[PDB]
Every structure is written in C-alpha cells, then in structure tokens.
Design a protein around this motif. Structure first.
Motif, mmCIF file in Angstrom:
data_model
loop_
_atom_site.group_PDB
_atom_site.id
_atom_site.type_symbol
_atom_site.label_atom_id
_atom_site.label_comp_id
_atom_site.label_asym_id
_atom_site.label_seq_id
_atom_site.Cartn_x
_atom_site.Cartn_y
_atom_site.Cartn_z
ATOM 1 N N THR A 176 12.587 24.457 -24.195
ATOM 2 C CA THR A 176 11.513 23.584 -24.649
ATOM 3 C C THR A 176 10.459 24.320 -25.465
ATOM 4 N N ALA A 193 2.720 4.063 -14.189
ATOM 5 C CA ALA A 193 2.213 3.661 -15.491
ATOM 6 C C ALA A 193 3.302 3.671 -16.552
ATOM 7 N N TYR A 194 4.541 3.924 -16.159
ATOM 8 C CA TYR A 194 5.705 3.976 -17.026
ATOM 9 C C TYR A 194 6.773 3.062 -16.449
ATOM 10 N N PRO A 195 7.726 2.614 -17.265
ATOM 11 C CA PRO A 195 8.813 1.780 -16.732
ATOM 12 C C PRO A 195 9.776 2.579 -15.864
ATOM 13 N N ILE A 227 2.527 3.666 -7.442
ATOM 14 C CA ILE A 227 2.068 3.068 -8.687
ATOM 15 C C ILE A 227 2.651 3.855 -9.849
ATOM 16 N N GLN A 272 19.184 5.915 -12.874
ATOM 17 C CA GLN A 272 20.366 6.419 -13.549
ATOM 18 C C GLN A 272 21.122 7.302 -12.565
ATOM 19 N N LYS A 323 13.343 3.389 -14.328
ATOM 20 C CA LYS A 323 14.752 3.261 -14.662
ATOM 21 C C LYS A 323 15.562 4.127 -13.714
ATOM 22 N N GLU A 381 0.816 -1.214 0.000
ATOM 23 C CA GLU A 381 0.000 0.000 0.000
ATOM 24 C C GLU A 381 0.850 1.265 0.000
ATOM 25 N N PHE A 440 23.816 15.866 -18.618
ATOM 26 C CA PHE A 440 22.594 16.520 -19.069
ATOM 27 C C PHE A 440 22.881 17.737 -19.942
#
Ligand SMILES: NC(=O)C1=CN([C@@H]2O[C@H](COP(=O)(O)OP(=O)(O)OC[C@H]3O[C@@H](n4cnc5c(N)ncnc54)[C@H](OP(=O)(O)O)[C@@H]3O)[C@@H](O)[C@H]2O)C=CC1
Ligand code: SF4
Ligand code: SF4
Ligand code: SF4
Ligand code: FES
Ligand SMILES: [Zn+2]
Lengths: 47, 82, 74, 123, 117, 693, 68, 123, 57
Positions: free
Chosen positions: G53, G32-34, G30, G38, G36, G26, G48
C-alpha cells in the motif's frame, strides 16, 4: 529441481530480522538491592 | 619535480629536524627554482621524513629524508628531482 | 553470498525501453527485474527452464492447461 | 593470538572481507539518562549490495547480510579488541567523546552588570 | 481507465476500481500508493482475477468529515470515545481538548471535532 | 581549587562552587532531573532533583545547591524516595494521556522517570478533569503539542541564551502559564531545531518527522554532517532503506551538542530527486542506460574528443568525500591534466592564500580556540550562515567574558554586538591601522576570521596581503602559543581538497577544456562549460550539473558511504554508512576506478584498504582521525603564502557582499528538500511572523 | 462454513444465548458504511490479491536537460 | 549403561604434536579407506578418486596450523565427521555439501576483475 | 482467530499507529508504516500481518 535434491545456500530473508533491543531503557532500572548475608558471615568492624 | 612535491614530516620528531630546517629556510628558494611545480608540506606525529615527487602521467617517486643536515636533505631532494 | 550468475550487469535496459534494476544478492529473495512467459513450461525442457529462471527471482508467467500438472513449478 | 576463526565454523568471508566497529553508544540527545553508554558495542559495517531492498510482493525489507542485526556487548574496549583478534575480525575503534566539565552556579544568573547588559535573562 | 505500462502496452481497468476507496477518488497520504500505481506495478498477479471481490474498505477520512461539530460551553472539551451500551473500557484514553482558538478542534484519537459555544 | 565531600558514603572531589548535581554525576550517583541541563543556565523549577544534606533541614535542589567542604549528602533516604514520588504525582496530574499518539513515546524522560521513581498508579480522578492548553504555531519546523509541556523552561533558556532568539518566553501566571510567543511569531533561528532535542516531553516535536517511527525500530549510526564545513558529529536514525532523522551527538570540541537546522532537516532531500540509473543525453532528452553503456560512451567521447594535457577538467563540489577527490585527481593526472578545479567562483584559478602549508586555509585556532577569545575581527564573513554552531560558540564566549568583536563587510544580523568598520578593503586598511588594530595588538587571545567568500574574489590576494602584513607584525596574533589567523571554510569538502592539492596549475586556468567531469559540482554555471565540451556529472541528486551533462552517473550520498571529511579546523573525521545507495547507484571512488580502467589509465587501488593507503601517501593527517595537531611552520607560512606572492594584486572598489544568499538552500540535497523550500519561504525577513516590532 | 454470516457464526458455536435477530438495538453496531457479507473466495478468481500500500521510499529524479 | 556407537573415539587431547600426528595420519587413512563405502552409501555421480581428492584437500587446508590445542580440536572434529559419514547418519543432501565443484556451471557470469565486479555492484 | 482492524461508530479508523502491537508481537508478524494524514490525523499508511508467521497469541 535441477539437482533433484535439498540444497544449502547462503541465507537470504524476504523480511530482515528487526532487532528492537535498541529501545532498551536509558535509566538504570532496579538499583543495588539489599544484602541478606547473616551476621556470622560478615567481617567485623574494629570497635 | 616537474609537477608535484610533497614533504611529509613530524612536528616534534628529532629525525625530522633537518627536514624542518630545510622547509623553514629553503622552501622559497625551492619554489622559485621550480616555478611550475606544486609544493605541499604536511605534518603528523608518527611519520618518518619522506618526500614524494610527481613527474608526468601520474608517475611518482619517493625517498626517505632520515638525514643529518640540511645540506644532505637538499642533496637527496636534488637527486630525486633528477 | 549468492550471485546473479545469469546477469552481466545490475542495471538493464530492455529493447522495449523498460529499466530493470536487480535487487539483492541473487538468491531466492532477490529479483532480477525481468518478466518471462514460458509456453510449455510444465513439460520436460520447460520445467528446467522455469527452475533456472525462478532461481534468481525473475518473474515467470506459466500458461497451463491442466492444473495438477504444473504444481511442482511453484 | 589464537586463530579461533578456524575452529568456530563461521564463514571465511567474515574474517576476510567484513569490517567491524567497536565503540561506546553516544549519550542520546533526546534523553538525560546514560544507562546505555557504558558498554562496548561491536557490530558489522554494512555491505552495499546485500544490506536492504524492497520486496516486490508486499513491500517488506529483504536482506542478504546475516550479520545485519547482530551486536556484541563487552565490558571493556580491551575485551572487545581481544575477542575481535581471536576471531580474525578487522576492526575500527571509535574513541568515545565525553562532556567537558565546567563549573555551574545558579547565582551566576544574577551577577551585577557594570555596563550595558549584553542580554536580558528571563527565567 | 487506460494505464500505460512499463512495457509500453495498455492496461484497461474499470473506472470504479481506480478509485482509492468507494467513497473517495484520491489518496489521503503522501506515502500512499494510488490504485493506478498498484495495478501498473502488480498487474501480473491481477490477471484472470475479479476486482469486484477484492477488499474495498470505505475511507475513514470522509466518514469522520461527515460528523457534525460538537459545541461546548467552556474552554475544554473532554473526549473518551466510550460505548455507553457495553460494559468495560471500550473507547480511547480520555483526553481534554482546548477550544479557545477559533474554529473546530479534532480529538487526536477519534477525529471528533469540538468548538467553543 | 578542588574541595571534597561525601555522597552516598562515597568520597568525591570537585572544583569549589560547582553544583551538587555535578558532584553527584562525578561520583557516579544517578539523580533524576527535568529542568537541569549541562549546557543551560540552572533553573531549579522542576524539583525532581531533591536530596538530603545533613546541614540542610529540608531536602535541597541538587542542581542549584553549591557544594561545600565536608558536605554529607544522601540520595537514597526514605524522605528522598517519598519526595520523588510526590513530585512525580504533581507532574503527572495535568499531563495528557497522549503516549500512543505522542512522538516522545519510548524515548521519554517523563515516562522513564515515572517508571523508575514514581508511583505505579495515580490518585487523580477529579471529575472536572485536566487543564488543557491551546496549540501554538511557531513555523514549519517545530510542531507543538502544548498539553504535554511540563514548564521546565529548557526551550526558553536555549532560545534566549544560546541562540539569541528572545521571541520565545512564558506568558500568564500560575496554572495558566504558557510557553510561547504571546502572539503568532515564528521561532526564527537557524538553531531552532535543537529545542526538539531539549524538550523532555513531546511538547516540541520534529514536524516533517511526525508519526513516522518509534525509537525502538531505528538503526543508529554515528556519522558526520556535511551541510557545512564545521563537521558536526551526528547520529543518523534509519529504518531499512530510508533515513528517518538526524540528531546531534556530543563533541565538545566541534559542535558541543548542537546542529543547525539545515543539518537536521535537509535529510528529506535524500529520498527525492535521486539519481538511480546512468543517463545518456540523446538530443534534448536523457535516456536511461546501463553502466557498461555509459562508461563506454565516456570512453568513446574521450577517444573522439582526444583531450591533450589540460583539456580534461575536473571539478569537485561542496559535498564530496576525500577518497573520491583523490581518485578523481589521480585519474586526471594520469590523463596528463593538471586541471583539477574547485566548484566555487574563480575556482578555475588557484586560491590566493596558497596551498603549501595547511595553516594558510584553516581555522588555526581550533574551534575550541573561540572559547579563549578576547577580540575578534570578522573579515568578509557571516558566521551565522557559514557556520551556525560556531556562531553560537562565539555568542557563548561573548556572554560569559568581556570580548570585542568587529567586522569588515556586509552588515550582519548578529547574535552578539559587532562593530562595523565598513564594507571595503580600504576600510580594512583603516581598521588594522586604527583603534581595532590596537585592540588586536593589546589582546591576549586575538583571532582574525577570514571568510571563504573573500578567497573567491579576484582581488583576494590584496586582502590576504593586508592581513598577512598585520599578522607578520603583531606577536599577539601569531606566536608559538597562539595562532590567531583563521580561514573559515563554508563547504565540507574544501579543507580536504586543499589538503590533497585539488588546485589547478597556472597554465591549466588558461585552457578551454574539451571534456569536463563534475564531481558533485552543482555551483557550475552555463558560462563555466564550453558548448563543445563533453560533460560527465557524478552525484546523488539531480539539481543543476546533471541538467548540464551529457552522461550522468549515480553516486552515493554521504549517509550511504564511510567517507573521510576534513572540517575547517583541519580535523579529519570518518563517517559510517547508514544505508546502501538506492537503485543502481555506486560508491564514487569505485565509479572512478572503473571509468579509469575504461580509459586506459586504470588506477592502482581496487579495495578500501588500498585507498586509505593512498590517502596516507598524499597526506599523513587524513588517516589520523579526530586529531588536531598544530603547525610548526606558522611563521614561514604567512610570509611565504600570504605576504609574499600577493604584492601585485590591486584591490577593487567593489564592496564585499554576502557569501550565501539563502541559508536554507546551498547544495544539491538542501535544494532537493521540500522542508528547506518551505522553511525558506516561512523564515523570510519581509514576513511579519519573523519581525518583533 | 464461511457462508454463515457473522453473529450467526457466534450463535452456532454457543457463544451467545440470544440469536442476532433477537438482539436489542442497543447491542448492535452502528455503521456509517453499507454492510456487505462475502464468504471465502479462495480457489476462485475472487481470491484476495495482496499488494504494497506504499509507493517506493526513494523517488527518482525526473531527468531534465538544460542548454549551456 | 550408555555405550558408545560404531567408530566412536573417546575425546583425548594429545599432549604432544607427534602423538597427534600419528592419530591424524590414521584418520586420513580411515577416510581414504572409507571412500568407496561413501560412494556406495551416498549414490554419488562422481568417482572414487574424486572423493579421495576432496579428502586430501580437506586435510591439506590445515597443513600449517601450529598451536597444539587448535590441532587437537581440528582432529576431534574431523573424527566426528568420519563417524558421521561412515555410519550413514548423513543423508545425501548434507554429504554433497562437501562437493560444491561437482555441481554444474551456475551461469555465464562469475566476475574476476574490478570492472566486472563493479557492473554487478560487487566491486 | 483471524485478525481484523476496527472502526469507531463514526466510521473513522481506531488505529492511530502507536505501533505497540508491532513492538509486542512475539513472532514479528506485524509491519507498520505511518505518517500524518492530509487532515492532520496520525494514521497508518501500511498495516501488514504475515498470518503464516503469527502464533495467534
Ligand atoms: N525432447 C526432445 O528430444 C526434443 C524436443 N523438441 C521440442 O522442445 C520443445 C519441448 O520439448 P519437451 O519438453 O521434450 O516436450 P513436452 O511434451 O514434454 O512439452 C511440450 C509442451 O508443449 C505443450 N503442448 C503440446 N501441445 C500443446 C497444445 N495444443 N496446446 C498447448 N500446449 C501444448 C505441452 O503442454 P501439456 O502438458 O498441457 O500437453 C507441454 O507443456 C517442443 O517444442 C519439442 O518439439 C525438439 C528437439 C528435441
Ligand atoms: S511526553 Fe512522554 S509521558 Fe507525555 S504523552 Fe508523550 S510519551 Fe507519554
Ligand atoms: S515546551 Fe518542552 S522544553 Fe519548553 S518548557 Fe515546555 S516541557 Fe520544557
Ligand atoms: S498501531 Fe497497533 S496497537 Fe497502535 S493503535 Fe494501531 S492497532 Fe492498536
Ligand atoms: S533539575 Fe533540579 S529542580 Fe529541576
Ligand atoms: Zn475522541
């Protein structure tokens, strides 16, 4: 580097200063207050 | 002039009364006398009576119309046109 | 105010057809729009040339061999 | 008019090639409050080359005009003019505009019409 | 793949790094710069750099598009985005969404779609 | 007469019958309000404005309570404070928690009056929650978020009374009362965008502007709109290099506090299709070039072409400022040319009303003159498109006093009753010799409004003759207290152009130019340019003339310079630059100064002070800002310019047509605007969204 | 130190009593993406590269000629 | 107590322009005399005559100021600057602010006419 | 410590571009740009923090 020294130049900013005081309130915020003067320091009213 | 004449005068000023009379009475005479010139009349409160003329290739000349009579106004005008 | 003492005008066309517009007055925060590579920039003459170029904000690409030797250019 | 320009230490260009505006803030069209409209603002007209440009690294807005964010507040138009003269600043006064007064009556919404109604008021 | 530069020379970029996000090829806002434009305008600072290490967050618009519509009985769905597992106030301000009109209606805050039924 | 009352101890004197909130405002007492507005009918539905009156037993609505002699009012009692808290509590109980996503945030009267007069925290925690409302689509200009609506009815009163758009209203009853159209209908009016200002909350917002800025991050600049010839006073809100939005500011003698939708939403045309670098035609394509290259190319084309006298033609478009027109004319005259033309049809020839007296091409009755009107004749003019805020002014006058309005020309969809007298000059002859002529003879403040579109006709003199004769007769139309003759310009630059005499000589209209200089001139056709002609375009947007050009020069837009503009009234107004011009664009008078130095004829002013001097030389009224002064030459002008020279003109049998086909796209900026294109498709007459039946 | 995975980084600094492998379901995020992990790539080709943008605020005209 | 430092002069506003003229010429003499000390402290490239020329130009700039109060302030600040220079309180970097002309040519393009200024957006 | 932008469990961004962070920032370290997303959401198109201006307050 050309002069090998600290030099002074006219100001140039990579990001210009943003002055947010343009968002000050359009309504008078506090009002007049109240007076705390003692009665011995107020002019008398006639009668 | 050959090409342009500009009359600057006050609307209420006393110093502009001869100029006002000159425009009001002989503006048509002047326009017919010089059929190809472009004549402009412009008014504002604080300004002193004056006339500008524009002859050719932008050359201009001016004379101040602080005068006594319409006759003398037209005298100064004709002098400047020469 | 600073100036772009190196530039004759503000809009420039390279011989390769790139349009460069200079931005700003010409100081450290300004950009000329040019990009230059200086081979041998860490040496005696190159360091002066790089200083002059970077002063007005033209982009300078510096190829180097030894890292510690080029640090002052930054 | 004392030439305090020469004692302040400001750059000469400020009293030579810059123009300031003296005005009162207009009543905003979005709000009914008038609290910001009484002061006399003094601020600098923009310079074309130095005002604002886009930085090529991150996209921030750069500037070369050190007065771009400065605004003085004065309690009267005359105080502002006096200060501007004392600093050798060329200025322009923008006279304020105010709402013309008219009489408003709620009852006017219901006045009897003797001929054809010009419009249907709805409330 | 091949992006033509202002110089007139070619920049090669692997296809996968031209995608705006790993889960989306194209931009999702008119003002948003595309990856191709970013490389075209910033290639100098990308030379001798490894693109696979650069941040590549997933686009949230596709992710929220993947969430099923919640069906509600009345005229008004209520959303707060709360975390029922943690303590404190962890969602968004609680708002009420009208679902009388046909179709689904999105929460202004979290994008969850509600529909009357 | 004025009566006298006391408010918070102070003594205030106000005209009898005025509302108590008006006296409070006059006496410097602040009263909170939502539904009241100075320009709308009193409503009294929000209940925020309650005060105590000693005669009144319960608190009264200040906005709707008439003042009476000897009235004693207190705005600061404990009962009044309590009532303000109670009303704010009731107002906020169904209001949505939307401030982070709402465009009103930071300039919101609900937020501010909650802070000033409300409780610091709410009491409403009901588990059934709040009321929610459907959203409603009323076109591409006004985005709706109707959960926020506080039912002040300002939008409805504005749409009905001021703009004449009755499609808006309130449906249902009680808690389910909703502002809207009850079915999918656009809020179809050129004044519609004003409701965004009027909505106290974020219920009605600017759709193209949505989510792009907060008020605290915006530089505010007071300037002048140039989308039409009214010269509406505006505030431009910009951040950094780009202009975010355009809002009205108050000028009770011009636009009063409104603007039209073009002035409001064509701003997005300023960030697209912009001219940023000089262009030179080479073959069938433009190539970017330096300023030195382009100016040198102009000079070489001048040397080669070798125009004599009036082979150098200068054309001024609808948007140009006076300083630029003056510099262009001075350089053109120094070239030996008298071919300074305007960009309108038949603008190769001089206008038929003449240029000698200002009162021959101006709105001689001020804009405020319309408030006094008793009868109006419209001649070849659709004010609803040509001057939208002046059309609103006419409607307000019509609604509040008896007034007779008739028009000769195309049938117009009007927001006030109009009497159609026909579309021909013969119809005008009949009318001025008929019943409406008698109406004009009998009235106290008549005015005849002639459109700038009649000037552009070949037969223009005929019309100006007819009117002129009538005016020279009827003392009510022209006497020492009232000039009822009015020309309504449509373009912001025309009044100033005539002011400096930017008008061709008679022999100049004969010649075929070898060199044409277009200054913001995007009404030009293929026909108006000779094929052999060398064409220079100077502007800010790439629309039409730039396509015709051999050399293109980028100039500043109106938001990027401090220009002078003369409106239809003859009022000279001064703008302020919000931002600088993009890229390598330049202030236009400086362009002309540089190019004149390249041409040998280098102009005698290189400084802004010297340009303002030269302007004062040309006309003393160009430097007297925000002032309107009457002509002493009103009678002379009509005879000398309208009745005199126009006798020979023969009237045509062609009917008068609409001057502007599309209200939404008229100049280069509006035709560069995605919002204007969307609105032009959205608000078309043949679309059922715009059709009540 | 940047090679320590988040969660373990908090545990190693005595932020939480219970270690990530022992944390109940609990109280996990959660995704919804993998996921990773780094570390810091500074001083390395993977450092970087920042950028704007946004495309530029003013868009220029695409020049088009027309025939008279 | 708190004692004054080397070459400190208590602030006194001269009541008369002649009594200020005496002090002013004395300050000018002090500057001219300190010029070689300045050239030694600040390791300058240029000559002692260049320093003295610069000093003359500085004093020349205020040759026509009339108001007594302004002259008093100009004198008090000039004395502050003398004290700063003679005590080696300044470093070379701030001292060389006074000699912008002594640095080399900044570039090929310093515009003088309208067209050159207009090509660099400085018109 | 170092800043981060969070998501909802669905994967949608939580930031709705209210710009309250930008307004409050004592160092003016935040620069924000927003507009309507092609799905209608209020979202940022640019969110920058100058970590060398930030005071980590
Ligand atoms: N100084 C003088 O009097 C004269 C100099 N010149 C020429 O001027 C130019 C630069 O002058 P100066 O600054 O004095 O010389 P420097 O030695 O100081 O710099 C020369 C540059 O060339 C680089 N260099 C030398 N060999 C190589 C190599 N195999 N590969 C890559 N880079 C190399 C050096 O890089 P690195 O540091 O890594 O070795 C260095 O940056 C030279 O071409 C020189 O021949 C000619 C006339 C007068
Ligand atoms: S209308 Fe005002 S109070 Fe309501 S959500 Fe918008 S900003 Fe907040
Ligand atoms: S939409 Fe706005 S203006 Fe119209 S009634 Fe609601 S709150 Fe008032
Ligand atoms: S703009 Fe800042 S305060 Fe507003 S939601 Fe985004 S991160 Fe939070
Ligand atoms: S303002 Fe008086 S009741 Fe609304
Ligand atoms: Zn939600």
């Amino acid at each position: 580097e050309e002069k090998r020294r600290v030099v002074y130049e006219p100001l140039e900013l990579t990001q210009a200063f943003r002055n947010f005081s343009a968002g000050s309130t359009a309504w008078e915020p506090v009002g007049p207050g109240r007076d705390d003067r003692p009665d011995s320091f107020k002019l008398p009213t006639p009668k | 002039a050959l090409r342009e004449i500009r009359f600057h005068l006050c609307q209420n000023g006393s110093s502009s009364a001869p100029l006002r009379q000159f425009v009001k009475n002989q503006i048509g005479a002047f326009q017919k006398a010089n059929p190809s010139t472009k004549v402009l009349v412009r008014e504002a409160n604080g300004v002193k009576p004056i006339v500008f003329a524009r002859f050719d290739h932008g050359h201009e000349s001016k004379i101040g119309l602080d005068v006594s009579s319409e006759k003398e106004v037209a005298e100064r005008v004709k002098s400047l046109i020469e | 105010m600073n100036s772009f003492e190196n530039l004759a005008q503000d809009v420039n066309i390279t011989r390769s057809g790139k349009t460069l517009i200079a931005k700003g007055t010409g100081g450290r925060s300004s950009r000329t729009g040019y990009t230059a590579t200086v081979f041998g920039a860490n040496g005696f003459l190159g360091s002066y040339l790089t200083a002059k170029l970077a002063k007005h904000g033209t982009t300078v690409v510096v190829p180097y061999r030894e890292e510690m030797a080029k640090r002052h250019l930054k | 008019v004392p030439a305090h320009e020469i004692v302040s230490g400001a750059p000469a260009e400020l009293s030579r090639n810059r123009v300031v505006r003296i005005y009162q803030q207009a009543k905003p069209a979005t709000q009914s409050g008038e609290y910001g409209t009484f002061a006399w603002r003094l601020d600098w007209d923009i310079v074309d080359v130095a005002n604002r440009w886009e930085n090529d690294l991150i996209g921030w807005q750069s500037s070369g005009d050190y007065m771009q964010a400065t605004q003085m507040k004065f309690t009267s138009k005359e105080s502002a003019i006096k200060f501007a003269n004392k600093q050798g600043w060329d200025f322009y006064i923008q006279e304020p505009h105010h709402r013309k007064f008219r009489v408003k009556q709620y009852a006017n919404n219901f006045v009897h019409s003797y001929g054809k109604l010009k419009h249907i008021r709805t409330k | 793949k091949s992006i033509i530069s202002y110089n007139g020379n070619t920049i090669e970029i692997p296809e996968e790094y031209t995608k705006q996000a790993p889960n989306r090829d194209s931009t999702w806002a008119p003002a948003q710069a595309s990856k191709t434009e970013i490389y075209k305008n910033n290639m100098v600072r990308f030379e001798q750099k490894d693109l696979s290490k650069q941040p590549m967050p997933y686009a949230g618009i596709e992710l929220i598009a993947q969430q099923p519509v919640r069906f509600v009985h009345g005229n008004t769905a209520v959303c707060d985005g709360a975390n029922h597992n943690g303590p404190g106030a962890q969602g968004h301000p609680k708002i009420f969404i009208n679902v009388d009109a046909p179709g689904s209606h999105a929460c202004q805050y979290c994008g969850t779609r509600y529909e009357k039924e | 007469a004025e009566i006298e009352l006391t408010i918070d101890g102070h003594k205030v004197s106000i005209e009898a019958g005025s509302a108590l909130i008006q006296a409070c405002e006059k006496a410097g007492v602040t009263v909170p309000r939502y539904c009241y507005h100075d320009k709308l009918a009193i409503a009294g539905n929000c209940r925020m404005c309650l005060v105590d009156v000693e005669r009144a037993p319960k608190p009264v609505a200040s906005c709707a309570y008439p003042v009476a002699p000897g009235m004693v009012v207190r705005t600061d009692t404990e009962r009044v404070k309590q009532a303000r808290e109670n009303v704010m509590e009731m107002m906020l109980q169904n209001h949505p928690l939307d401030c982070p996503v709402c465009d009103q945030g930071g300039e919101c009267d609900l937020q501010d009056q909650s802070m000033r007069y409300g409780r610091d925290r709410g009491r409403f925690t009901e588990i059934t929650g709040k009321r929610s409302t459907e959203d409603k689509n009323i076109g591409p200009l006004v985005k709706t978020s109707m959960n926020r609506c506080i039912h002040c009815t300002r939008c409805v009163r504005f749409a009905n009374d001021i703009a004449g758009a009755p499609e808006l209203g309130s449906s249902g009853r009680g808690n389910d009362m909703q502002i809207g159209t009850y079915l999918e209908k656009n809020l179809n009016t050129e004044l519609s965008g004003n409701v965004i200002d009027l909505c106290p909350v974020g219920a009605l917002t600017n759709k193209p502007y949505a989510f792009r800025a907060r008020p605290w991050e915006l530089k505010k600049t007071e300037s002048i709109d140039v989308m039409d010839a009214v010269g509406s006073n505006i505030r431009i809100d910009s951040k950094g290099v780009e202009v975010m939005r355009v809002i009205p500011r108050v000028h009770e003698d011009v636009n009063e506090e409104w603007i039209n939708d073009k002035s409001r939403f064509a701003c997005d045309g300023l960030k697209t299709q912009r001219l940023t670098t000089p262009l030179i035609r080479v073959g069938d394509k433009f190539v970017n070039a330096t300023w030195d290259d382009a100016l040198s190319t102009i000079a070489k084309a001048y040397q080669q072409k070798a125009p004599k006298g009036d082979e150098f033609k200068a054309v001024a478009g609808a948007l140009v400022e006076v300083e630029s027109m003056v510099a262009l004319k001075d350089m053109t005259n120094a070239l030996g040319s008298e071919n300074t033309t305007t960009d309108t049809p038949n603008g190769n020839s001089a206008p038929a009303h003449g240029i000698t007296f200002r009162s021959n091409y101006l709105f001689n009755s001020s804009i405020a003159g319309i408030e006094d009107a008793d009868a109006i004749l419209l001649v070849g003019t659709n004010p609803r498109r040509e001057a939208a805020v002046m059309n609103a002014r006419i409607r307000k006058a019509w609604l509040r006093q008896e007034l007779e309005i008739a028009s000769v020309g195309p049938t117009l969809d009007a927001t006030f009753d109009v009497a159609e007298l026909g579309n021909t000059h013969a119809d005008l002859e009949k009318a001025l010799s008929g019943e409406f002529g008698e109406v004009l003879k009998n009235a106290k403040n008549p005015l005849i409004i002639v459109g700038s579109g009649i000037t552009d006709r070949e037969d223009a003199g005929a019309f100006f003759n007819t009117i002129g004769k009538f005016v020279e007769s009827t003392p009510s139309v022209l006497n020492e207290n009232w000039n009822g003759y009015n020309v309504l310009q449509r373009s912001a630059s025309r009044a100033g152009a005539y002011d400096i005499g930017f008008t061709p000589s008679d022999e100049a209209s004969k010649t075929t130019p070898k060199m044409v200089w277009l200054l913001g001139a995007d009404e030009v056709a293929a026909s108006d340019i000779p094929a052999d002609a060398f064409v220079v375009y100077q502007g800010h947007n790439g629309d039409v003339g730039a396509q015709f050009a051999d050399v293109v020069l980028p100039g500043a837009a109106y938001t990027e310079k401090a220009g002078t503009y003369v409106n239809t009234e003859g009022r000279s107004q001064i703008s302020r630059a919000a931002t600088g011009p993009p890229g390598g664009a330049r202030e236009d008078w400086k362009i002309l100064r540089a190019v004149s130095e390249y041409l040998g004829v280098a102009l005698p002013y290189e400084d802004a002070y010297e340009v303002r001097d030269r302007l004062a030389e040309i006309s003393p009224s160009l430097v007297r800002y925000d002032l309107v002064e009457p002509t002493v030459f009103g009678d002379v002008a009509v005879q000398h310019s309208l009745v005199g020279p126009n006798g020979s003109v023969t009237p045509s049998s062609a009917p008068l047509t609409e001057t502007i086909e599309n209200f939404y796209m008229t100049d280069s900026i509006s035709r560069s605007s995605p919002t204007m294109a969307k609105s032009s498709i959205a608000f078309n007459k043949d679309n059922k969204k715009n059709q009540a039946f | 130190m940047s090679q320590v995975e988040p969660g373990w980084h908090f545990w190693l600094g005595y932020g939480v009593d219970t270690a990530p492998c022992n944390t109940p379901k609990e109280k996990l995020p959660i995704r919804a993406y993998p996921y990773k992990f780094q570390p810091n790539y500074t001083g390395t080709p993977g450092a970087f590269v920042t950028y704007n943008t946004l495309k530029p605020k003013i868009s220029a005209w695409e020049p088009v000629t027309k025939q008279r | 107590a708190i004692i004054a430092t080397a070459f400190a002069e208590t602030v006194k506003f001269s009541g008369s322009k002649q009594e200020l003229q005496k002090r002013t010429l004395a300050l000018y003499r002090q500057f001219l005399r300190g010029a070689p000390t300045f050239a030694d402290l600040y390791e300058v490239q240029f000559s002692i005559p260049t320093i003295r020329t610069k000093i003359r130009q500085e004093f020349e700039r205020h040759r026509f100021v009339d108001d007594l109060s302004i002259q008093n302030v100009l004198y008090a600040k000039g004395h502050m600057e003398y004290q700063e220079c003679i005590n080696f309180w300044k470093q070379q970097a701030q001292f060389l602010k006074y000699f912008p002309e002594e640095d080399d040519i900044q570039g090929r393009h310093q515009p003088s006419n309208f067209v050159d200024k207009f090509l660099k957006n400085r018109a | 410590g170092e800043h981060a932008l969070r998501r909802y469990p669905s994967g949608e961004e939580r930031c709705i571009a209210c710009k309250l962070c930008e307004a409050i920032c004592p160092a003016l370290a935040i620069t924000i740009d927003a507009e309507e997303r092609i799905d209608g959401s209020r979202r940022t198109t640019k969110y920058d923090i100058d970590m060398t201006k930030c005071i980590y307050c």
